């Protein structure tokens, strides 16, 4: 097991009695409504938010993909590889998977284009792909994705999720915040919340039996 949670209650109640045991390389789908507790459950794993009741025991390093895409002043390559070792093939694999090839190629300076003030501002969906690229690049043991497809088109995310979450990271442990039935259809475990309380937990077979 790479990430665990037993009898967890949180106050910034935001999360009430959280229970899950995710094995290595398994995809966990954290679903819920606006305000269910999903964006705060990941803060518990990251250690940003400390709990009141229960314990959280995870192994390895964590790589977060923020719900709100943020661009760092610099190049596209710098936005993806800053602070991490440049592996030519690890880098190329992430571009093709996060659907950034065309987006990059359409530029005069390519992956070297500057995104600061007095430069090139990228669309709400290009910021989202550069941010998920930044995450899937960083070699970690646990991947926390918080609504990575929120500002992305349904055809593109289809291409990202299946070639990124389900292929590129297929042997890495993941936690995806998504409502999409199409995504929960692919998960190993499903956790569903409403105002903190875990309304659902188990396999997709247990869900598709409701």
């Amino acid at each position, epitope marked *: 097991t790479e990430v665990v949670m037993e009898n967890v209650t949180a106050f910034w109640p935001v999360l009430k009695d959280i229970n899950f045991k995710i094995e290595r390389g398994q995809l966990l789908a954290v679903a819920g409504s606006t305000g269910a507790g999903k964006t705060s459950l990941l803060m518990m794993i990251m*250690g940003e938010l400390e709990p009141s009741e229960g314990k959280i025991k995870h192994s390895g390093r964590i790589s*977060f993909c*923020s719900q*709100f895409s943020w661009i*760092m*002043p*610099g190049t596209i390559k710098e936005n993806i590889i800053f602070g991490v070792s440049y592996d030519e093939y690890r880098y190329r694999s992430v571009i093709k998977a996060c659907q950034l090839e065309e987006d990059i190629s359409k530029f005069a300076e390519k992956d070297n284009i500057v995104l*600061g003030e007095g430069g090139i501002t990228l669309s709400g969906g290009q910021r989202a792909r550069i941010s998920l690229a930044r995450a899937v690049y960083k070699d970690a043991d646990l991947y926390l994705l918080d609504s990575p497809f929120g500002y992305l088109d349904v055809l593109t995310e289809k291409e990202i999720f299946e070639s990124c979450v389900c292929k590129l990271m297929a042997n890495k442990t993941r936690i995806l915040v998504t409502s999409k039935m199409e995504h929960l259809k692919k998960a190993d475990k499903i956790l569903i919340l409403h105002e903190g309380s875990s309304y659902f937990y188990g396999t997709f077979s247990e869900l598709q039996n409701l």
Partner: nanobody
Amino acid sequence: QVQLQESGGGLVQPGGSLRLSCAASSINAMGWYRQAPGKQREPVAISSSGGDTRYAEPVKGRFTISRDNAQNKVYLQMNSLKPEDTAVYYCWLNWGRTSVNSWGQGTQVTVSS
């Protein structure tokens, strides 16, 4: 309305140390940039949403970045300083859902004999 306050600037002997401080709702990332005379701004160190500390290749294994979410403060421990590190240090902050870039005024750090 970011309002970034830098501190801990100075002049030091090569092999010396300086600590840099910066003080700033929901923050995306908080780090430091540098602009050497003639050159353009280059990132030094950054602290992310989950405390993912990312450093520059020339500064790696020499500086440390420590954030305070409780006070909206950020600290650069500039150890083993080389004269190459002679530049003005800009505190940065990425904030909001729309990813706004807020910059500090800049504190001058000079590494000289």
